Write a protein that binds this ligand. Structure first.
Ligand code: LBV
Ligand code: LBV
Lengths: 305, 305
């Protein structure tokens, strides 16, 4: 069972309790975007990332208590209609906002709360190539190469889970000069059980800068519930410090993975690294999510044979 | 063998490599004091903690290259005479400085380098009580109580090493309401082998604030050697982040220990905690060092019986 988060008196995580970190409720975000939460009926802004002024032009204490009707008059009606009470928490509303400089808006609903993520923003032959791979190994190779071409990441791996939850790099596409990880295996604890569970529900996550301090969300508890705000569905969620350290020690400045899900079970990850911090553009992330779903379908087919 | 320190490309320490942390050369200090290093012949200031202006009234780049003859005209001759080339690195010169507000100065020599520590500053019946204890347990109890009375620390333990380097609290004096650690045992890795080795040579160390960021020493390499500056003999040395985290998880804001050395081997520690950060005053530290040496002598006697 999860430890309380750090802002509810919980301990700092060590290797003795990797699996107890409540990674879904860090009460903080990554600094390359801003996050607000708002009441799902009134649109009242309830919580604000402390960097909100960087992206939204108003300080957290000024945004607090204003409504989405006032702040986002052109989106608020569409937002309400798209995300009614009781919809799945993976259902998203997306908009491109004009700002005096575009800003990508992504919204999802958890219970009675709307979670709004703001970040700056600017194939058919590839799909057929995945379809055309004659065996699992070839599929893995095509997938990693395709994703590397799409994203420009220094390394793209297909990381496969064994039944004991150990992991192995079974294919990779890599920049000239990087060491090989192909065939290397890793303990189950490197991607602990609560992360694997989260990754079965929320299919993409990332750390754009593995040295960047998390930006608090405040007030940290959702005022509706006096309880932590679920951020498993927010790509801007702060990453576990244990994993950030693993990445820094690996010389990785930016990391992103997409779940490969087969028969409702986490089969593996498309796992990406960059040496230098790097924000994969929002449109490239959406494409990569779609490729993950397509790869998932293809892996199910090839491994059966 | 030690990893390189973090400023020479070394990794961040994890539980897989506790013993490889080069804790003696962190290239940084605790913020409750200031540290300079100076050439042992010229007195030229070679390195400066980045907080030097807080204590010394001049910025690091202004202090750099000035001589101790200019900066400390009243102490420099005595300092030279007290710490000639080739003296033991545990030999100290101490002075009380008048400042516009006293400042404790502690100096030692390592090779051709003088290491100067600056921090703010403001029994016979007890010794006889240690002498008078009729057995090891009673000695342990008297020692912890005496140290607690001297220091005001919330907890004072006698932590004894077993031959396998596991540790046990064999006596303690504690504030009302604290849980007992008496009889609890701990793995050898909690005080890893390079720490135990350091603690056989340098008999007192502390962390005054277990949440305080370390203050860099710059330039970080000694310009004499283009190599790290040994800080094992400096009480202001930054503490291992692994240990700081252990203490925070324990609810300890301030920690200090004194080595108990029997037949040249590390027998145990007088180990002190405070819940709130706390700078044990310099004069109290000197007294506590002396009590450690006296306790060491007494333990040798009692355990033989
Ligand atoms: C005691 C806790 C530990 C720990 C926790 C942890 N790890 C993750 C997430 C990931 N770990 C990954 C591992 C690898 N990436 C690689 O490239 C390789 C080998 C080549 C390995 C073994 C990966 C891929 C992830 C997923 C996220 C990502 O793609 O960047 C989490 C969850 C992080 C989060 O979502 O907030 C946690 C809690 N990892 C350890 O090694 C120990 C120290
Ligand atoms: C993988 C590394 C780990 C680690 C490293 C570490 N620990 C120390 C120093 C100390 N540890 C102490 C342990 C205890 N204090 C207690 O009160 C109790 C139990 C009641 C224990 C087990 C102590 C007493 C010290 C000495 C310093 C002090 O008195 O505060 C070091 C060296 C620190 C330094 O001098 O810079 C290191 C590297 N400890 C772990 O638990 C693992 C994570």
């Amino acid at each position: 069972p999860f430890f309380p988060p750090l802002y509810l008196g919980g301990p700092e995580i060590t290797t003795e309790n990797c699996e107890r970190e409540p990674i879904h409720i860090p009460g903080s975000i990554q600094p390359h975007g801003a996050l607000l939460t708002a009441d799902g009926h009134s649109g009242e802004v309830l919580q604000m990332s402390l960097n909100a002024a960087t992206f939204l032009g108003q300080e957290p204490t000024v945004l607090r208590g204003q409504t989405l009707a006032a702040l986002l008059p052109e989106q608020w009606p569409a937002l309400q209609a798209a995300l009614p009470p009781g919809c799945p928490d993976a259902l998203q509303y997306r908009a491109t906002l004009d700002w005096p400089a575009h800003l990508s808006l992504t919204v999802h609903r958890v219970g009675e709360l709307l979670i709004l993520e703001f970040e700056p923003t600017e194939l058919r032959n590839a799909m057929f190539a995945l379809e055309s791979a004659p065996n699992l190994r070839a599929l893995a190779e095509v997938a990693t190469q395709t994703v590397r071409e799409l994203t420009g990441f220094d390394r793209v791996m297909l990381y496969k889970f064994a039944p004991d939850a150990t992991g192995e790099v079974i294919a990779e596409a890599r920049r000239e000069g990087l060491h090989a990880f192909l065939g290397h295996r890793f303990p189950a604890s490197d991607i602990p059980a609560q992360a694997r569970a989260l990754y079965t529900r929320h299919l993409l996550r990332l750390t754009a800068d593995t040295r960047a301090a998390a930006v608090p969300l405040d007030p940290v508890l959702n005022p509706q519930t006096n309880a932590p705000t679920p951020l498993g569905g927010a790509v801007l969620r702060a990453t576990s410090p244990m994993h950030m350290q693993y990445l820094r020690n690996m010389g990785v400045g930016s990391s992103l993975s997409v779940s490969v899900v087969v028969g409702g079970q986490l089969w593996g990850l498309i796992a990406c690294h960059h040496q230098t911090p790097y924000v994969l553009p929002p449109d490239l992330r959406t494409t990569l999510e779609y490729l993950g779903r397509l790869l998932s379908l293809q892996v199910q087919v090839k491994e059966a044979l």
